[PDB]
């Protein structure tokens with residue numbers, strides 16, 4: 683293989699938090715203004731040079747609501763983005779219930795990052811950054827605020843994960 687490492691990452695979080703757009707903004711630098719709820723499981727790939735070595739991230743992406751294929755979706759996942767909508771406090775509370783789901787199906791030592799998405803909708807921010815920092819520290823998660831719409835921190839969040847995974851694995 684051309685790459686040194688192949689890291690399977692999963693995106694989870696409630697419907698409409700922007701998971702699919704985060705991905706397409708990372709892989710294909712596009713903001714899908716015309717997005718729609720995801721059917722089944724979609725995939726995407728990116729090959730990066732962190733460390734001076736070749737990393738092929740393999741990103742799985744599924745919808746938020748109504749399963750049983752939870753099974754294959756999480757299996758072998760080695761990093762995860764836990765994404766909530768910065769303007770809808772309901773999506774941020776459900777993060778712990780996603781975190782239990784994610785944890786019942788992965789190794790305790792995967793790299794997990796909490797993402798607060800849509801940080802551009804600044805006048806509707808309904809979740810205090812400090813409260814999300816609280817949940818992140820309480821649960822040993824990484825933490826970022828992102829905007830898929832204006833690319834803010836999207837690259838930083840994904841690479842950060844991928845670097846943190848390699849340090850475990852070397």
Ligand SMILES: Nc1nc2c(ncn2[C@@H]2O[C@H](COP(=O)(O)OP(=O)(O)NP(=O)(O)O)[C@@H](O)[C@H]2O)c(=O)[nH]1
Nearest residue numbers: 697698699700701702703720745746800829830831
């Ligand atoms: N303002 C703004 N809107 C965003 C951002 N990211 C996503 N959205 C909006 O939120 C909606 C949901 O995006 P989408 O990525 O499809 O959500 P999802 O989390 O993938 N949903 P599902 O779980 O059902 O697939 C879209 O209408 C999109 O415009 C962002 O950074 N900023």
Ligand SMILES: [Mg+2]
Nearest residue numbers: 701702719720
């Ligand atoms: Mg989607």
